[PDB]
């Protein structure tokens, strides 16, 4: 049995080759932002409410048209065949069965149409290409295959400095490819995407308050407050530390998701209490995939669902909206 | 000789089976709140007063009708026969002899009437039952047996995630039972209890300021500001960190107790200086019981009494009321 | 050569019996205040001034009538024959030769008249006795022997809980006695002392702002902001953390000294910059005495004098008054 | 390959004699300020901007008349033949080739005319001499040799207490000399220098806001906010912690540089975001010189240039001016 997400990290470290575990675990530079994502969540304490009706605790949310079983989606993580032979199909099947949205990557190692054919709630994560037209073509491919939202990742004009990868001499195995086959994206790219599709466009990698405001003005349906899991700018603030200010600035004008460092249902509760609509979870999903394939991811999502229900009810929240109204206190 | 409560922890760790020591010591989840209870007290420094009359330093208080020898009571801890064969009777006898209130548990391993027959100042701690009527029946049983206050624990709609217990496969030995034999309690349950008894109702597990205010409005005679020793919501704020704000909000409308992490008479002084009427002490009482039964608990209460007197007088306080008027400073 | 006061601590630990080193080093309780005295100084950073005239840097001050070579005096430390056979005479001779005031203890292991006969600038530290009349008699004895100030220690209604001493079973060797041969002192005792002598009365152990104000109103010539080296109330705030608020409240109405944790000339500079008139130094003087007797104390005072001159000049201060006008910043 | 500046520190520790590595690495006193320079940078997080045009990211700045390839110069470090036989010539050649200003030291181990003959952008760092006239003569020598700015170091009325050097018995080898061959400098010295040369005078070692303002009033063309790498006053605030307040006080009246602890291009970005015109880098340049002479310094400057470009672009900054408008957040 796994009783925490940390149990899955230990299992994945046992099974994966060291250089693949380091590609997964590592951040850029000194890994200051990778560590700070965890420090920031550990400093947040919740002030629970008592004596409220918990007859029907529900962890469901509605987001981008549709019901999700938890306030969580699987983050976009490139090249999932690095971690298990079934790669993205194993994760997308488990996400579908758990009622959790799965984000299909531009750099997926199985084609986006095959993963979308699994069913469930697929979103599609876009990187802008130097060849523009390939960008809007991926978007249209995703929409034609049934993806529900376009998650436009905006924090990768190029890959950050991954010193573990450099020191390991890491490269993709011959058997892992970009099965769908960086330019800096700008606000003009966002408008090109928004014009090309009626799906909600979600800008992922926003940390500045004024960029969140501009995203609403630009017609985004959501943002993901994120420093890319500490893998891009080393020293970028954690998303969790900007979330409350961004939620206030947005005034309900779009959905505000957060990612980076979510390692338990209690962390999901903290993100909700700071105002997030939902969270993304990246590395833990890959730990479960590495450890035990589709069944591993299933067990992870079952464990997270139980932890979120436990934390919500112990905090007096019968719904995710109630959890958003909880207050927090920073500790040491 | 034990010269600190930490000496008793070391003695109990020697004698108890590991899985029982872990049931006692552990918290929920990552044990963030278990640790934070201690961190929070360690950050509080007292500003002592000098040159005041200390001719007659007294640690006594009046609470819920009656005199207590110290501003402290034994917290409700279920199943005390886990720790020593005499269980609750050993602890209740030592508490009586020390002039300290003892809280009889709904989940006591000796019946509440037997423990109440020990004498002293017994309080009774209630859990709300799915069978309501059993709830009001326990209350009436407690009142009929001479209990002085009903401590209604409101932070357990269900048991939190005790990972030590899960990993140890912990269960009650066959020889430990609930000798008096969870539903979520609500404010309606509180009113049902308040209507059923003329004893003071004390709501235990309050952390939000508005819940403390509502408790006064609901007719509570006291509250215990508490995160259940870090055993329920992992990431719940320590009670000590909410205490000052709650004492201000209550405006003397009820007694305000605190628990979590009290490990010395100096910690009692800090809680008093932050405004507590009294503290509860949980794990250290069980350490003394495990180490040396009734005589162990007696020695613990003698040591705590000496530490409280020492700290009060060194801080210039001839009474607990004077200690409540001390100022504090947070450190690092 | 000793190049820091920490070199002397290491030397004293080598030479002294463990239980005597623990009597010297230890604090009360968990030693929270003993540690916090050091933490508090380590958090203070100085903002130095540049490009000022340093032609004649002087570390001298005038205090309680007389010139001192440094803004420092030897703290009162009982029973100095515990540390070296010459005890107080060795320390008082070195202090005299360095131009530093030496505080003669009520509990000195050489009589106050013998130590005063060494010469120099002796102050006398008073404990109030249950036999009052013995108190005013010690004061008159000190004045008759040439002491310049009465340092009335007010934070010892009784000795704090010294767990090292308890665990070691520590007691005075037969060869160490109180050669001049606790009741709680009150403000009435202060007035009795102030009436009995024309010497300045300095109240040692003040931490609350209103007690500092009351000391000025009571006719004190000085106060020592102090938690008794962390040896009395465990959890008492460090004096360094109250110093700035106290200096502001006093408005120049008396001298404001500080002690606790001074381990370098840079620490003296920090205390001055926070507003202290001078500091006391306790344990390091005993380390030097243990290590090398009178010559050890001489070397310590020479090293401290050089460190204070170095720090003052590097901070742009040609006088201690200039150092008091420096600004500080708290760090981590 | 070196992939971080920390790789070069490890290489230099391998090659240099321990006492020379300690002369380079060490600070004064307890090395509180040496450590705090690093702590202060590690607490700064950047809030990056997204979706801006990065077609032409440039790290160039204009400073003191001339273009520099990065917002950085080589700090003045005395006696560089301690670290490699080619000493200052190796470093100045690599700096020239990288388009980075090199600061020639008053205490250089190769004469200032020889180093200036390397070409590039040489600045000259002045110490004030007890023989004044030698001071203005060095200035005129530097100007005659083509130096572009006079960096007047004002924080060394004498050398701080270098306990590593004392404990190692460190002295200059016979083969290292002051090839150009302390008095306290004052504002009058600054005016003497400003009158003697039309080059910009840059005062290095300013930490107080009012000294920065006075520097502008005195006609300085720049200041370096600096605690001398933690080598002078132990307990002096880090320059990075004063930088923002100083930049605000100066109101664009002079260039404001900072040094101390810069160990990556991300640290350069943080200093820029706090308002620095440019940084100086000291110890890492000497690590590269020790490790591999001129080619080592070349590799260091190439690595720093790539790290600055990476950090700027990941933070959405196409120019150093844009990076100065970034906001920051302090973390833990
Ligand atoms: C752990 C991991 C995270 C990510 C990726 C891969 C790995 C192993 N991807 C890439 O390598 C993309 C790339 C970038 C540069 C060069 C080649 C490929 C990836 C990505 N985000 C995204 O939009 N698309 C991606 O394709 N990320 C961030 C992820 O979406 C979340 O932001 C964090 O994982 C939340 O933090 P976590 O829960 O603490 O892990
Ligand atoms: C250490 C311990 C504490 C408690 C318990 C047992 C143990 C070993 N109890 C239960 O397992 C109840 C239960 C819950 C879920 C499933 C079965 C039983 C218990 C309880 N509080 C309460 O109302 N009634 C209880 O019956 N608590 C908290 C206690 O009252 C104090 O809140 C903290 O002990 C102060 O923190 P401490 O001084 O640092 O320890
Ligand atoms: C380290 C030490 C300090 C002190 C003492 C002895 C020792 C070894 N004395 C006693 O045992 C008095 C006593 C108390 C209770 C029972 C018997 C004797 C002593 C004293 N202060 C004072 O008025 N008179 C004293 O007779 N102190 C505090 C001292 O004056 C300074 O407050 C701190 O030493 C600054 O902190 P430091 O620089 O970090 O050490
Ligand atoms: C690491 C080092 C730094 C410096 C020096 C030598 C060493 C090995 N110099 C001296 O020994 C001068 C001296 C002083 C007293 C007695 C004899 C000689 C030196 C200097 N600054 C300056 O104006 N001129 C100098 O001649 N410094 C500071 C340097 O300019 C930077 O302020 C810090 O190096 C940024 O911090 P860093 O990037 O973390 O290293
Ligand atoms: Mg996450
Ligand atoms: Mg407690
Ligand atoms: Mg001291
Ligand atoms: Mg630097």
C72 DSSP assignment: E
Q: Shortest CA distance to A35 belongs to which of B225, C118, C311, D332?
A: D332
Quick check: D325 contacting A, CB < 8 Å? Answer: no
Which residues touch B251 (CB under 8 Å, ≥6 apart)?
Answer: none
Concatenating the DSSP letter of every residue in C146-172 gives T---EEEE-S-SS----HHHHHHT---
Three-state secondary-structure class, residue C189: helix
Nearest-by-CA chain C residue for D240? C331
Residue found under tokens 């007691």: C171
CA torsion, points C152, C157, C158, C164, in degrees to nearest 10? -70
- Residues A209 and D300: their CA atoms lie apart, in Å, by 35
Residue C121 tokens read as: 């600038």
Quick check: B330 contacting C, CB < 8 Å? Answer: no
Q: Shortest CA distance to A235 belongs to which of C100, D127, D307, C275?
A: D307
Instruction: Provide the pairing of β-strand B201-206 with A61-63.
Output: unpaired
Which residues touch A319 (CB under 8 Å, ≥6 apart)?
Answer: A57, A58
**Measured between alpha carbons, how far is residue B89 from residues B85, B143, D137 in Å?**
9, 19, 92
Residue nearest to atom 17 of ligand 4 (CA): D159
Cβ contact B–D (≥3 pairs, < 8 Å): no
Question: A5-329 belongs to which homologous superfamily?
Answer: Aldolase class I (3.20.20.70)
Residue found under tokens 């299909």: A104
- CA C148 remoteness from chain centre: 15
Task: With beta carbons less than 8 A apart as the criterion, state whether C125 and C104 touch.
Answer: yes
The catalytically annotated residue of B81, B162, B228, B231 is B228
Task: With beta carbons less than 8 A apart as the criterion, state whether B257 and B278 touch.
Answer: yes
Residue found under tokens 């009995």: C196
Contacts of D184 in chain C (CB under 8 A): 53-55, 313
Domain boundaries, chain B: 5-329
Where do the DSSP E strands lie in D207-267? 222-225, 255-258
- Residues C203 and C212: their CA atoms lie apart, in Å, by 9
Q: Which atom of ligand 3 is nearest to the CA of C204?
A: 23
Q: From the CA atom positions of chain C, what is the Rg in Å? A: 19
Q: Which atom of ligand 3 is nearest to the CA of C227?
A: 32
Q: Shortest CA distance to B168 belongs to which of B24, B22, B293?
A: B22
Q: Is B263 in the pocket of ligand 2 (CB under 6 A)?
A: no
Task: With beta carbons less than 8 A apart as the criterion, state whether B143 and B199 touch.
Answer: yes
Q: Is A300 in the pocket of ligand 1 (CB under 6 A)?
A: no
- Whether A228 sits among the annotated catalytic residues: the reply is yes
Interface partners of C (3+ CB pairs, < 8 Å)? Answer: B, D
Instruction: Count interface pairs A-B at CB distance under 8 A.
Output: 100
Quick check: B55 contacting C, CB < 8 Å? Answer: yes
- Residues D234 and C6: their CA atoms lie apart, in Å, by 15
C46 DSSP assignment: E
Residue D189 tokens read as: 């010295």
Q: Report the 3 state secondary structure along chain B.
A: CCCCHHHHHHHHHHHCCHHHHHHHHCCCCCCHHHHHHHHHHHCEEEECCCCCCCCCCCCCEEECCEEECCCEEECCCCCHHHCCCCHHHHHHHHHHHHCCCEEEECCCCCCHHHHHHCCCCEEEEECCCCCHHHHHHHHHHHHHCCCCCEEEECCCCCCCCCHHHHHHCCCCCCCCCCCCCCCCCCHHHHHHHHHHCCCCEEEEEECCHHHHHHHHHCCCCEEEECCHHHCCCCCECCHHHHHHHHHHHHCCCCEEEECCCCCCHHHHHHHHHCCCCEEEECHHHHHHHHHHHHHHHHHHHHHHHHHHHHHHHHCCCCCHHHHHCCEEEECC
């Amino acid at each position: 049995t796994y009783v925490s997400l940390a149990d899955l990290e230990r299992a994945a470290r046992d099974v994966l080759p060291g250089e693949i575990f380091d590609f997964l675990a590592g951040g850029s530079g000194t890994e200051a932002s990778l560590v700070a994502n965890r420090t920031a969540l550990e400093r947040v304490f919740v002030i629970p409410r008592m004596l409220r009706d918990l007859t029907d605790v529900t962890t469901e949310i509605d987001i981008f048209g549709r019901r999700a079983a938890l306030p969580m989606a699987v983050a976009p993580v490139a090249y999932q065949r690095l971690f298990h032979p079934e790669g993205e199909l194993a994760v997308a099947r488990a996400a579908r069965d758990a009622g959790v949205p799965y984000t299909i990557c531009t750099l997926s190692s199985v084609s986006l149409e095959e993963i979308a054919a699994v069913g469930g709630r697929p979103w599609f994560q876009l990187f802008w290409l130097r060849d523009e037209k390939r960008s809007l073509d991926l978007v249209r491919r995703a929409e034609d295959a049934g993806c529900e939202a376009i998650v436009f990742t905006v924090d990768v004009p190029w890959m950050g400095r991954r010193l573990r990868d450099m020191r390991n001499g890491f490269a993709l195995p011959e058997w892992v490819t970009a099965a769908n086959f960086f330019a800096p994206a700008t606000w003009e790219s966002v408008e090109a995407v928004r014009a090309h599709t009626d799906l909600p466009v979600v800008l992922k990698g926003i940390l500045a308050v004024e960029d969140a405001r501009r995203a609403v003005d630009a017609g985004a349906g959501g943002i993901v407050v994120s420093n890319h899991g500490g893998r891009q700018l080393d020293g970028a603030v954690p998303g969790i530390e900007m979330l409350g200010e961004i939620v206030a600035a947005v005034s309900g004008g779009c959905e505000v998701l957060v990612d980076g460092g979510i390692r338990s249902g209690g962390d999901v509760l903290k993100a909700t209490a700071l105002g997030a609509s939902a969270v993304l979870v990246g590395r833990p999903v890959m730990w479960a995939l590495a450890a035990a394939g589709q069944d591993g991811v299933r067990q992870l999502l079952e464990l997270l669902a139980e932890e979120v229900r436990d934390a919500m009810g112990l905090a007096g929240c019968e719904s995710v909206g109630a959890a958003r109204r909880l207050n927090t206190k920073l500790g040491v």
